[PDB]
From a paper:
[name] is a homodimer in each structure. Each monomer contains two domains: an N-terminal superhelical linker domain (IPR037061) and a C-terminal iron-binding domain (IPR016084).
Iron anomalous difference maps extracted from our native data revealed that in all cases each monomer contains a single iron situated in the middle of the three core helices (α1, α2, α3), which are surrounded by four auxiliary helices. In the [name]·Fe structure, Fe is coordinated by three residues that are part of the conserved iron-binding motif in other HDOs—E181 (α1), H191 (α1), and H274 (α3)—and three water molecules to form an octahedral geometry. E244 is located on α2 and aligns with the fourth residue of the metal-binding motif of other HDOs and, instead of coordinating a second iron, is within hydrogen-bonding distance to two of the iron-coordinating water molecules. V278 and R281, which replace the terminal two residues of the conserved metal-binding motif in other HDOs, are part of a loop that disrupts the α3 helix. A flexible α3 helix was also reported for UndA, BesC, and SznF;11,12,16,24 however, assembly of the metallocofactor is sufficient for folding of the α3 helix in SznF,24 whereas α3 folding in [name] requires binding of both mononuclear iron and substrate.
Numbering used by the authors:
A (entry chain B): 2 to 326
B (entry chain A): 1 to 118, 122 to 327
Write the structure that this text describes.
């Protein structure tokens, strides 16, 4: 129950920057140790994003420990250090760079255009599991990685809730979280429903799971960054693409599981996501509609969307390679 | 406008040197020097105020109020960073529970009840008796607004620090109820706004308190709910929500006697539970942590400190109520 705590993960990293981060997380750490960690981390991320493959792997691993470890005693300082890395990352990302706000029509047109080109539904990994062609072993590979995406999604959504100062917008995210965490029954939380499916196909569902897939780490790192961003356009973009527009995959996966011999109860995880409302008829769309006139929101939202698609594609490509190797 | 509870406007209107240092540290481009300078000056100011300097006390509590409870999210992470520098000083001075070994679950539940027993406040007896004028009820409800209107945000900070999925689920159920279930017009802040309108008061979602004891109460409650040792936050959650049915039932009855309709007083009615606190699912948040002595000491320390700031606040409300 400390396997996903910061110190045990840092001690498994031979790099000197991991020792410096450990010092900044100590109980008696001062501003000197914390600032020293922040400077070394920023330099490491800079070197990796400029093309140093070793620095790149190291900074992504350290950002994963900083942003997603479960020892709350170190969380405030860990997120402080993560922001030093995020500032470097956002410098390197291609940016929307609009000078004036798109019209509401033009904004929605751009949104629709990008989703068509990049939807997770068109990826070989998705259609292959859609088609019913996956073996049980390949379904296990798919679902081991679905675990990492699902099991702490609600925590990222809670970070956006904390950043929504308007009481009615906070209410919208609380309704989302209530559904995600099982309404009146904790055993129906969507992490626990997925745990039930994993156990049905002979996998363990580890709530202290730590990924060793580089593309998965990058995906989870990005998702946490976006949902925590003080400019909520970043988090709303990932929330929109991953919750307001994905009831279609889960219907195709639910059907595929029932064909593979799974019961409706064991496949409940995908069933409970099947939905009927278009994205703009969802009450959460108002949070985006409200902000469309502000070009700063438009730039953050569109930049977030494109970066999400890039890391999602690399991740899904890597799962596919694992399924075919 | 509705951005006057942002941090920079408030700091600009505070004519003391520490306010300029803090404002410079909140800029997105602030350097480590600027942030560390503010943290040092705030910690020194808090220590002076805690040791009997009345001007420093008023100054640090006002700065902590701006840091911890302003609504501009652009500065929130650094604001909370600086707030912690003050919290570390405050907690040094607080009388602390000193259990050397953890109590049993049944012994711990009995011990926290003894803290509650240690209400009978003259204001509570006066209001519950039906003796208050509508002008006096206005005094009480003006301050109820400050306690209620952003309570959900403090509970959300506790949710963030509850790593177990089932414990997060319990707080999400609380937040769902607190924010109106399927209908945001029924969120508990908006239910209270309806009651305030009924009695003749405005309900301002950008309200800023000027009562020192109320500021101290809200500052403490945010600190406790945000603490990385969640014994602090679960202690105040136990008080502010799990064991308020009796108080809110008596207030509900008093407001009906004052001529409010059931609908107008819905805010209080929805808090009247049908079972005692141990029979609620939220109790498992506390029962699961009881074998941990650090949890127990933080929980008891937080209870006592919460009751100290609550009593000073209730005394000050009562003084205001008697003056009308
Ligand atoms: Fe879900
Ligand atoms: Fe409530
Ligand atoms: K910084
Ligand atoms: K925060
Ligand atoms: Mg009557």
């Amino acid at each position: 129950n400390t396997r996903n705590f910061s110190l045990p993960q840092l001690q498994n990293l031979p790099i000197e920057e991991a020792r410096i981060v450990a010092d900044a997380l100590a109980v008696h750490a001062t501003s000197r140790q914390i600032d020293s960690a922040a400077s070394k981390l920023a330099a490491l991320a800079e070197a990796g994003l400029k093309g140093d493959r070793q620095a790149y792997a190291a900074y992504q691993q350290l950002l994963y420990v900083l942003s997603l470890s479960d020892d709350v005693a170190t969380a405030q300082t860990r997120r402080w250090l993560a922001r030093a890395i995020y500032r470097v990352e956002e410098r390197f990302m291609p940016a929307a760079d609009l000078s004036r706000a798109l019209s509401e029509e033009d904004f929605q047109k751009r949104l629709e255009q990008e989703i068509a080109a990049q939807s997770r539904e068109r990826h070989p990994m998705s259609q292959y599991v859609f088609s019913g062609s996956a073996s049980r072993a390949q379904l296990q590979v798919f679902l081991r990685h679905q675990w990492f995406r699902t099991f702490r999604l609600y925590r990222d959504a809670a970070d956006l809730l904390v950043n929504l100062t308007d009481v009615d917008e906070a209410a919208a995210l609380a309704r989302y979280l209530y559904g995600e965490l099982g309404e009146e029954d904790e055993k129906g939380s969507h992490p626990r429903l997925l745990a039930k499916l994993l156990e049905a196909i002979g996998l363990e569902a580890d709530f202290q799971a730590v990924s060793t897939m580089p593309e998965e780490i990058a995906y989870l790192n990005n998702r946490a960054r976006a949902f925590r961003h003080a400019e909520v356009g970043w988090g709303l973009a990932v929330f929109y693409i991953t919750e307001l527009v994905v009831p279609g995959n889960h219907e195709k996966l639910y059907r595929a599981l029932l064909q593979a011999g799974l019961s409706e109860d064991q496949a409940e995880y995908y069933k409970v996501h099947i939905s009927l409302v278009p994205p703009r008829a969802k009450r959460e769309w108002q949070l985006i509609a409200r902000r469309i006139p502000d070009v700063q929101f438009q730039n953050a939202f569109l930049t977030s969307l494109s970066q999400h698609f890039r890391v999602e594609r690399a991740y899904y490509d890597a799962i596919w390679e694992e399924m075919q190797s």
